[PDB]
Amino acid sequence: KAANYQYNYLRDGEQVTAHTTCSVNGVNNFSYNGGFLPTDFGISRYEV
Amino acid sequence: ASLIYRQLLTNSYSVDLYDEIEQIGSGKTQNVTINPGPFAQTRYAPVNWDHGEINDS
C-alpha cells in the first residue's frame, strides 16, 4: 500500500527537508489455500 | 532700436530658467536597454511518445 514518510538531512550545510511516498506496480499476486474447511488456513491473495 | 539684439544676447541666460521650466513640465519615460545574444534558439529535446505506465498484475 502507498506509504508516506518525511525526514531531513544535511547537504553542504543547508538543511534539506524531504517528503516521499513509496508504492509498487506490476506486483505479482500469489494465492494459497491450505484447506477448504472453516478451520483451515488460507490467504486469498498476497502480493510479491 | 539696435539695442534689441544686444539685449537679447546679454539676457540670453534666462533661457536656462526656461529650459528648467519646460523640463519640469514635460513628462518623462526611459529604457530598459535590450539584451543582444539570442544567437542560439533552443529546441525542446528528443521527445518520443509512448503509452503510460500500464498497471499489470
Side-chain angles (χ1 to χ4, degrees), chain B:
Chain B
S2 74
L3 70 93
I4 284 290
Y5 306 101
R6 287 172 277 163
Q7 201 155 332
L8 289 157
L9 274 295
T10 53
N11 297 23
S12 309
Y13 72 101
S14 291
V15 306
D16 312 327
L17 304 174
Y18 191 77
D19 291 19
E20 292 275 26
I21 291 298
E22 62 85 7
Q23 181 162 102
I24 291 298
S26 83
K28 188 78 165 180
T29 55
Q30 193 144 326
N31 267 6
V32 191
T33 183
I34 300 155
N35 200 358
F39 310 144
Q41 49 185 312
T42 306
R43 322 309 288 191
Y44 307 124
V47 163
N48 199 334
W49 283 107
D50 276 327
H51 64 302
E53 316 316 320
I54 60 177
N55 193 78
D56 300 347
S57 279

Side-chain angles (χ1 to χ4, degrees), chain A residues 6-32:
Chain A
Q6 64 85 30
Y7 68 104
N8 55 6
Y9 63 94
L10 317 183
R11 182 267 307 284
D12 298 11
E14 264 187 328
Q15 172 173 33
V16 166
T17 178
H19 174 285
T20 191
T21 70
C22 62
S23 158
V24 292
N25 174 75
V27 71
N28 283 353
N29 48 347
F30 285 26
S31 58
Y32 180 74

